[PDB]
Design an enzyme around this catalytic site. Structure first.
Site, PDB file in Angstrom:
ATOM      1  N   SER A  62     -37.765  27.004 -14.553  1.00 11.20           N
ATOM      2  CA  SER A  62     -38.353  27.630 -13.383  1.00 11.20           C
ATOM      3  C   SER A  62     -37.312  27.726 -12.277  1.00 11.20           C
ATOM      4  CB  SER A  62     -39.584  26.853 -12.903  1.00 11.20           C
ATOM      5  OG  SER A  62     -40.498  26.638 -13.981  1.00 11.20           O
ATOM      6  N   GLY A  63     -37.074  28.954 -11.804  1.00  8.88           N
ATOM      7  CA  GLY A  63     -36.074  29.223 -10.779  1.00  8.88           C
ATOM      8  C   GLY A  63     -34.677  29.504 -11.304  1.00  8.88           C
ATOM      9  N   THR A  65     -36.858  36.238 -14.180  1.00  5.16           N
ATOM     10  CA  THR A  65     -37.565  37.388 -13.618  1.00  5.16           C
ATOM     11  C   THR A  65     -36.600  38.366 -12.939  1.00  5.16           C
ATOM     12  OG1 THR A  65     -39.669  36.164 -13.407  1.00  5.16           O
ATOM     13  CG2 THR A  65     -39.482  38.119 -12.093  1.00  5.16           C
ATOM     14  N   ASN A  84     -39.662  27.114  -7.417  1.00  2.00           N
ATOM     15  CA  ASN A  84     -39.394  28.536  -7.198  1.00  2.00           C
ATOM     16  C   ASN A  84     -40.369  29.155  -6.205  1.00  2.00           C
ATOM     17  OD1 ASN A  84     -38.753  31.288  -7.349  1.00  2.00           O
ATOM     18  ND2 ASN A  84     -38.861  31.407  -9.591  1.00  2.00           N
ATOM     19  N   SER A  98     -42.335  31.832  -8.192  1.00  3.87           N
ATOM     20  CA  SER A  98     -42.505  31.429  -9.598  1.00  3.87           C
ATOM     21  C   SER A  98     -43.527  32.268 -10.336  1.00  3.87           C
ATOM     22  CB  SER A  98     -42.894  29.962  -9.709  1.00  3.87           C
ATOM     23  OG  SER A  98     -42.786  29.500 -11.050  1.00  3.87           O
ATOM     24  N   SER A  99     -43.160  32.679 -11.550  1.00  5.25           N
ATOM     25  CA  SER A  99     -44.070  33.370 -12.459  1.00  5.25           C
ATOM     26  C   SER A  99     -44.959  32.328 -13.085  1.00  5.25           C
ATOM     27  CB  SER A  99     -43.327  34.105 -13.586  1.00  5.25           C
ATOM     28  OG  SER A  99     -42.099  34.723 -13.181  1.00  5.25           O
ATOM     29  N   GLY A 103     -39.026  27.920 -20.428  1.00  3.29           N
ATOM     30  CA  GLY A 103     -38.809  27.024 -21.558  1.00  3.29           C
ATOM     31  C   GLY A 103     -38.932  25.569 -21.151  1.00  3.29           C
ATOM     32  N   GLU A 122     -38.234  21.987 -19.623  1.00  4.71           N
ATOM     33  CA  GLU A 122     -37.831  21.638 -18.297  1.00  4.71           C
ATOM     34  C   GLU A 122     -38.403  20.249 -18.025  1.00  4.71           C
ATOM     35  OE1 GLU A 122     -39.746  24.480 -15.744  1.00  4.71           O
ATOM     36  OE2 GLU A 122     -38.125  24.107 -14.311  1.00  4.71           O
TER      37      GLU A 122
HETATM   38  N1  LIG Z   1     -28.826  37.322  -9.779  1.00  2.00           N
HETATM   39  C1  LIG Z   1     -29.441  36.960  -8.637  1.00  2.00           C
HETATM   40  N2  LIG Z   1     -29.048  37.467  -7.443  1.00  2.00           N
HETATM   41  C2  LIG Z   1     -29.660  37.101  -6.299  1.00  2.00           C
HETATM   42  N3  LIG Z   1     -30.681  36.207  -6.262  1.00  2.00           N
HETATM   43  C3  LIG Z   1     -31.163  35.611  -7.390  1.00  2.00           C
HETATM   44  C4  LIG Z   1     -30.548  35.968  -8.677  1.00  2.00           C
HETATM   45  N4  LIG Z   1     -31.187  35.259  -9.628  1.00  2.00           N
HETATM   46  C5  LIG Z   1     -32.135  34.517  -9.005  1.00  2.00           C
HETATM   47  N5  LIG Z   1     -32.132  34.728  -7.668  1.00  2.00           N
HETATM   48  C6  LIG Z   1     -33.003  34.053  -6.669  1.00  2.00           C
HETATM   49  O1  LIG Z   1     -33.615  32.886  -7.219  1.00  2.00           O
HETATM   50  C7  LIG Z   1     -35.035  32.976  -7.214  1.00  2.00           C
HETATM   51  C8  LIG Z   1     -35.576  32.512  -8.564  1.00  2.00           C
HETATM   52  O2  LIG Z   1     -35.279  33.484  -9.565  1.00  2.00           O
HETATM   53  P1  LIG Z   1     -36.401  33.924 -10.617  1.00  2.00           P
HETATM   54  O3  LIG Z   1     -35.805  35.104 -11.340  1.00  2.00           O
HETATM   55  O4  LIG Z   1     -37.732  34.072  -9.944  1.00  2.00           O
HETATM   56  O5  LIG Z   1     -36.481  32.608 -11.582  1.00  2.00           O
HETATM   57  P2  LIG Z   1     -37.364  32.370 -12.918  1.00  2.00           P
HETATM   58  O6  LIG Z   1     -38.072  33.660 -13.247  1.00  2.00           O
HETATM   59  O7  LIG Z   1     -36.298  32.000 -13.910  1.00  2.00           O
HETATM   60  O8  LIG Z   1     -38.358  31.269 -12.636  1.00  2.00           O
HETATM   61  C9  LIG Z   1     -35.334  34.436  -6.927  1.00  2.00           C
HETATM   62  O9  LIG Z   1     -36.577  34.611  -6.234  1.00  2.00           O
HETATM   63  C10 LIG Z   1     -34.138  34.891  -6.133  1.00  2.00           C
HETATM   64  O10 LIG Z   1     -34.279  34.481  -4.767  1.00  2.00           O
HETATM   65  F1  BEF Z   2     -39.915  30.280 -14.608  1.00  2.00           F
HETATM   66 BE1  BEF Z   2     -40.080  30.976 -13.019  1.00  2.00          BE
HETATM   67  F2  BEF Z   2     -40.608  29.913 -11.739  1.00  2.00           F
HETATM   68  F3  BEF Z   2     -40.815  32.551 -13.019  1.00  2.00           F
HETATM   69 MG   LIG Z   3     -39.971  34.293 -13.257  1.00  2.00          MG
END
Ligand SMILES: Nc1ncnc2c1ncn2[C@@H]1O[C@H](COP(=O)(O)OP(=O)(O)O)[C@@H](O)[C@H]1O
Ligand code: BEF
Ligand SMILES: [Mg+2]
Ligand SMILES: [Ca+2]
Ligand SMILES: [Ca+2]
Ligand SMILES: [Ca+2]
Ligand SMILES: [Ca+2]
Lengths: 145, 724
Positions: free
Chosen positions: B150-151, B155, B197, B200-201, B390, B392
Site C-alpha cells: 500500500s502506497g 495505481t 496511503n 489507498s485503493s 500484495g 505487507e
Molecule cells: N511515479 C510517481 N510520481 C509521482 N508521485 C507518485 C508516483 N508514484 C506514487 N506517487 C505518490 O504516492 C502515492 C501512492 O501511490 P499509489 O499509486 O496510490 O500507491 P498504491 O496503489 O501502490 O497503493 C500517490 O497518491 C502519489 O502521491
Molecule cells: F495498495 Be494502495 F494503498 F492502492
Molecule cells: Mg492503489
C-alpha cells in the site's frame, strides 16, 4: 541451401545491414546498404521482397529470414556470375584490379572506419602475387578463407 | 581484501571487510570502524561493484548481480530521481513521493513509441509499448502485473500505462478519454485515506483495453475484487471513509445540499493535503465525460447520502426521516427492521450491515456503469493491467490479510512460472543450455479439505465459532509443511495466541501468524432477509435495481481469482514491481532494510538466484565496445562493436564454458565479467601483443564481411528480378 561456413560469412555480412544490432532489419536498412553498393531498388520492390519472409507483418526481418530472402533457384552458371559481379563492385574502373583507393570507396560507402594506412594493409594482406593490387583470383581466395 | 556487502539492520547492507572466515559465518569489520566486528552467514555477504558511484539501467549489467548490489544500484538511481530500473524484462519502480519533471510528458510518451526495451531509459512507458507491440506482432493478449505494498505506486503506474496506450495507440476520440476517466471515477467510491496511503485503493482491479484484429481500440473492461466493507461504517484514528462521502459534503451545490440534507463530515458518525472540494469538481467532470447524465449522478448521490444518514441512527429521529426518505422507504418499516426484540448491539449491527450492503451494491453498480461506457460486441485481443496489493506487514493479520496473501500466492506462482519461461527461451535462443508453492495454494483453496471450504462449513453450522473452525483447520492439516501453531513462534506475542485462536501459514513471503477471531463473521457477506426485503421494496426504482443467510467472501473471491488466472494464463505477461521507500510519504528518503525486505517478499531475490544458475551478466556489443575501446589499440577502436568484441574474444582466447558470444550480446557465467574487466584493465602492452598476433585473421574478417555483403546485395538484386 547453405553450408555452416557460408551461413557464418553471411551472418557477419548481415551486421552491415543491422548496424544497431539488435538482430533485426527493415526495408530502410535493406535499401541503404543496397544503394551503398551501387544498386537502386524502389520502395515497392523492397516491400514486395520483404513480403515473402515478413510473416509476421511487422516490417522487420531477422537473420534466418534474410537468408531465405536471398534464396532462389539458380542455373549451374549463376553463382559464378554473382561473384564476378561482386568483384566489379570493388573494381570500379573494370581494369581487373582492385586498388587501395577503390577499396576505400567501398569501405567508406559501407560506413567502415579505418585509416588510409589500414586500407593499404588490407590490400597488402589480400595481394598474393605482390603487384600492390587485388585481382580476381586473390579476391576469391580471400573471400573463401 | 576488497570491500564487500554485509547485512545492516536499518540499511539492509553496509560496506565492510572480511577480517576472518569461519565454516558457517564470516567476521566483518564495518568500513572505517576498526575494532568493531560482527558475524554474518556466508550466504549473506556479497561481492560489491568496484565502482560504487556508477548506476546501470539494467541490473544484468552489474559484474555481481545479487540482492546487495541490486539494492545499491537502485539506491544510487533513486537519489538521482531515476525511479525505474530493469532486471532483464522486469521493471522495478521506486515511489518518488514527488512530481519528477519531463518523464511523464506527452512528448516523452512519443519518444517511447515503437522502441525496444533497453533502447530508451527504463520506464513504465517501455513496458506498455512492448505489450502493445507483442499483442500486435504475436497476436496474443497481454497483461502487465503491477505489484507492491500500500502506497508503493501501483495505481499511479497503472494510470501511466493507460495514459501511454491511449495517447500512442488510441482512436483520437472519445473512447480514449473514457479509458483514462474510468479509474478516477472508481477511486471516488473505492479509494480512501489510510495510514499507509492518502489515496489507498480499497479494492483490487484488472483494467482491460480491448482491440480489434487491426489492433485498434474498440472498448474497455474493469474487474474488481474485495471491496473493504468494514470501512463503510468504522475507520481507524488517522483514517477516513471512502472519498465520495467527503467530496459530496464539501463540493455539492446548495441545491443538492438541501435535497440530500448534507452538512460537514463531523455531523456523520460514519465519517490536510486532501482537496475534497476540488476532487468533487474533477469527479463531476469525469462523470459527464463518460456519459452519466445528472439524473444518474443524483441517483448515486442520494444512495451515498442515504447511507450517511442511516449511520446517524443511534438507539436519531431526524436521521431516520432523512434516511428512509432518500432510500425510498417508510420510516416505520425501517425502524421496525432495525429493532425486531433486539439489543442495542444487535440494532447497531443491523444498521451497519444494511449500510455496508447498500454501499457495496452501489460500488458494483458504478463499476458496471463504467463498463457500459466503453462496451464492445467483439474483440480480438486485450491489454490488461492488474492493480492489487500484495503481502505487507500488519501487526494483526485477520481475514482481509488472509484473502490478500492467498491472492499473492497464486500471482507469485504465475510470476515464477513466467520468469522461468522467459529465461528458458533466452538460453535456448542464444545456445546457453524450482520449488512450487502449489502446496500452500492447496492448503487454502482445495475443495473440501482447504481452509476456505472448512471456513464455509463453520458458517453453515447452527452455532458457528471461530475456535471450532480453527481447531478443524489444525486437525485436518496437523502435518502440513505450510501450517503451524502460534505457540511454536520465536516471537512472544504470537505465543500468547491459543491453538484455537490462530494459525501460522508459511507463505511465499514468509510465515504469517493469523488471529482467527472474526474469521466466520468476515467470511459472510450476506444481509439478513428482514433487511434485504425492506430495501428490495423501495419506492425508488434505482434502489430496487441495485438488488435486482450466508454468502462466502472467501469462495466468492476464489471464483473471481480463478477467472483472473484463466485470463492471465492466456496472455503474454510483463511485471512492474513497485517499491515504497519509507513509511513517511517523503521524497529522497531511501530506507534500505524496508526496501530490501520488499525485494525479498516480491520474489526479486529469488529471480536473482535463478540467474546465478546460468549467465547473470549480459552486455551488448555496443555497451562493451563503449566501456572497453579505450583499453585497446586505435585500429581496434575503429570497428564496429560486433567485430570489436569478436576480435577481443579471439585475441584473449575466452573459453566456451565461461563466455558466450551471443546473437547480440555477450553472456558471462558468475564472476566471469569481473575477470574480463580485470583482463581489460591490465597491462596495455601485453594486450596490444595479443591483438597483434590476431591481425591477419582480423584483416581477413574485415575483407569477407564486405565481400559477403556485396554478394548479399547481388542476390537481393537478383531476387527482385526473379519476383518480376
Ligand atoms: N511515479 C510517481 N510520481 C509521482 N508521485 C507518485 C508516483 N508514484 C506514487 N506517487 C505518490 O504516492 C502515492 C501512492 O501511490 P499509489 O499509486 O496510490 O500507491 P498504491 O496503489 O501502490 O497503493 C500517490 O497518491 C502519489 O502521491
Ligand atoms: F495498495 Be494502495 F494503498 F492502492
Ligand atoms: Mg492503489
Ligand atoms: Ca537492426
Ligand atoms: Ca517480421
Ligand atoms: Ca580497378
Ligand atoms: Ca595482386
Amino acid at each position: 541451401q547453405l553450408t555452416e561456413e557460408q551461413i557464418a560469412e553471411f551472418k557477419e555480412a548481415f551486421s552491415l545491414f543491422d548496424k544497431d544490432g539488435d538482430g533485426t532489419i527493415t526495408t530502410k536498412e535493406l535499401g541503404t546498404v543496397m544503394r551503398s553498393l551501387g544498386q537502386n531498388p524502389t520502395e515497392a520492390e523492397l516491400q514486395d521482397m520483404i513480403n515473402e519472409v515478413d510473416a509476421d507483418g511487422n516490417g522487420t526481418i531477422d537473420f534466418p529470414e534474410f537468408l531465405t530472402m536471398m534464396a532462389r533457384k539458380m542455373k549451374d552458371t549463376d553463382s559464378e556470375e554473382e561473384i564476378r559481379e561482386a568483384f566489379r563492385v570493388f573494381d570500379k574502373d573494370g581494369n581487373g584490379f582492385i586498388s587501395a583507393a577503390e577499396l576505400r570507396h567501398v569501405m567508406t560507402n559501407l560506413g567502415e572506419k579505418l585509416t588510409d594506412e589500414e586500407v593499404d594493409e588490407m590490400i597488402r594482406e589480400s595481394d598474393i602475387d605482390g603487384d600492390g593490387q587485388v585481382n580476381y583470383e586473390e579476391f576469391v581466395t580471400m573471400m573463401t578463407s | 581484501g576488497k570491500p564487500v556487502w554485509a547485512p545492516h539492520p536499518t540499511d539492509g547492507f553496509q560496506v565492510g571487510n572480511i577480517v576472518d572466515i569461519g565454516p558457517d559465518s564470516l567476521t566483518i569489520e564495518p568500513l572505517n570502524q576498526k575494532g568493531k566486528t560482527f558475524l554474518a552467514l556466508i550466504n549473506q555477504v556479497f561481492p560489491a561493484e568496484e565502482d560504487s558511484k556508477k548506476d546501470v539501467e539494467d541490473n544484468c549489467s552489474l559484474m555481481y548481480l545479487n540482492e546487495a548490489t541490486l539494492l545499491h544500484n537502485i539506491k544510487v538511481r533513486y537519489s538521482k530521481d531515476r525511479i525505474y530500473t530493469y532486471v532483464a524484462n522486469i521493471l522495478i519502480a521506486v515511489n518518488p513521493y514527488f512530481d519528477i519533471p519531463k518523464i511523464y510528458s506527452s512528448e516523452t510518451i512519443k519518444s517511447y513509441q515503437g522502441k525496444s526495451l533497453g533502447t530508451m531509459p527504463p520506464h513504465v512507458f517501455a513496458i506498455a509499448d512492448k505489450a502493445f507491440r507483442d499483442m500486435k506482432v504475436l497476436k496474443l493478449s497481454q497483461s502487465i502485473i503491477v505489484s507492491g505494498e500500500s502506497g508503493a505506486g501501483k495505481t499511479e503506474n497503472t494510470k501511466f500505462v493507460l495514459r501511454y496506450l491511449t495517447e500512442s495507440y488510441g482512436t483520437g476520440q472519445d473512447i480514449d478519454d473514457r479509458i483514462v476517466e474510468a479509474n478516477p471515477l472508481l477511486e471516488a467510491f473505492g479509494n480512501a485515506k489510510t495510514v499507509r496511503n492518502n489515496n489507498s485503493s480499497r479494492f483490487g482491479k484488472f483494467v482491460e483495453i480491448h482491440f480489434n484484429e487491426k489492433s485498434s481500440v474498440v472498448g474497455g473492461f474493469v474487474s474488481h475484487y474485495l471491496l473493504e466493507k468494514s470501512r463503510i461504517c468504522v475507520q481507524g484514528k488517522e483514517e477516513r471513509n471512502y472519498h465520495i462521502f467527503y467530496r459530496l459534503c464539501a463540493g455539492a451545490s446548495e441545491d443538492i445540499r438541501e435535497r440530500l440534507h448534507l452538512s460537514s463530515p463531523d455531523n456523520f458518525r460514519y465519517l490536510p493535503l486532501l482537496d475534497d472540494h476540488g476532487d468533487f469538481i474533477r469527479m463531476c467532470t469525469a462523470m459527464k465525460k463518460i456519459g452519466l447524465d445528472d439524473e444518474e449522478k443524483l441517483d448515486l448521490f442520494r444512495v451515498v447520502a442515504g447511507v450517511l444518514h442511516l449511520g446517524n441512527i443511534d438507539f436519531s429521529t431526524q436521521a431516520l426521516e432523512y434516511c428512509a426518505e432518500l432510500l425510498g422507504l417508510d420510516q416505520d418499516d425501517l425502524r421496525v427492521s432495525l429493532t425486531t426484540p433486539l439489543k442495542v448491539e444487535q440494532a447497531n449491527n443491523a444498521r451497519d450491515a444494511l449500510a455496508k450492503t447498500v454501499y457495496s451494491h452501489l460500488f458494483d453498480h458504478v463499476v458496471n456503469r463504467v463498463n457500459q461506457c466503453f462496451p464492445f460486441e467483439t474483440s480480438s485481443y486485450f491489454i490488461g493491467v492488474l492493480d492489487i496489493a500484495g503481502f505487507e506487514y500488519f501487526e494483526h493479520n485477520s481475514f482481509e490479510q488472509f484473502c490478500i496473501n492467498y491472492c499473492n500466492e497464486k500471482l507469485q506462482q504465475f510470476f515464477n512460472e513466467r520468469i522461468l519461461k522467459e529465461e528458458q527461451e533466452l538460453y535456448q535462443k542464444e545456445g546457453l543450455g524450482y520449488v512450487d508453492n502449489q502446496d500452500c495454494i492447496d492448503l487454502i483453496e482445495a475443495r473440501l479439505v482447504g481452509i476456505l471450504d472448512i471456513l464455509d462449513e463453520e458458517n453453515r453450522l447452527p452455532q458457528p465459532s471461530d475456535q471450532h473452525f480453527t481447531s478443524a483447520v489444525h486437525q485436518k492439516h496437523k502435518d502440513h509443511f505450510r501450517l503451524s501453531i502460534p505457540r511454536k513462534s520465536k516471537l512472544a506475542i504470537h505465543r500468547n495466541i491459543r491453538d484455537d485462536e490462530g494459525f501460522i501459514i508459511r507463505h511465499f513471503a514468509g510465515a504469517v501468524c493469523y488471529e482467527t477471531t472474526q474469521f466466520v463473521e468476515k467470511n459472510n457477506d450476506a444481509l439478513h432477509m428482514s433487511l434485504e426485503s425492506l430495501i428490495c421494496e423501495s419506492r425508488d426504482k434505482f434502489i430496487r435495481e441495485l438488488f435486482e443467510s450466508f454468502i462466502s467472501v472467501g469462495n466468492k473471491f476464489k471464483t473471481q481469482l480463478n477467472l483472473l488466472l484463466d485470463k492471465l494464463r492466456s496472455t503474454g505477461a510483463s511485471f512492474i514491481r513497485c517499491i515504497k521507500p519509507n513509511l513517511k510519504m517523503t521524497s529522497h528518503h531511501f530506507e534500505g532494510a524496508q526496501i530490501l525486505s520488499q525485494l525479498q517478499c516480491s520474489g526479486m531475490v529469488s529471480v536473482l538466484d535463478l540467474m546465478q544458475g546460468g549467465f547473470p551478466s549480459r552486455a551488448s556489443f555496443h555497451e562493451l565496445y563503449n566501456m572497453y575501446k579505450k583499453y585497446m589499440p586505435d585500429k581496434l577502436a575503429r570497428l564496429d562493436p560486433r567485430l570489436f568484441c569478436k576480435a577481443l574474444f579471439k585475441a584473449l582466447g575466452l573459453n566456451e564454458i565461461d563466455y558466450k558470444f551471443g546473437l547480440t550480446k555477450v553472456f558471462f557465467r558468475p564472476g566471469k565479467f569481473a575477470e574480463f574487466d580485470q583482463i581489460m584493465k591490465s597491462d596495455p602492452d601485453h594486450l596490444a601483443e595479443l591483438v597483434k598476433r590476431v591481425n591477419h585473421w582480423l584483416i581477413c574478417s574485415r575483407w569477407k564481411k564486405v565481400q559477403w555483403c556485396s554478394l548479399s546485395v547481388i542476390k537481393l538484386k537478383n531476387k527482385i528480378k526473379y519476383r518480376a
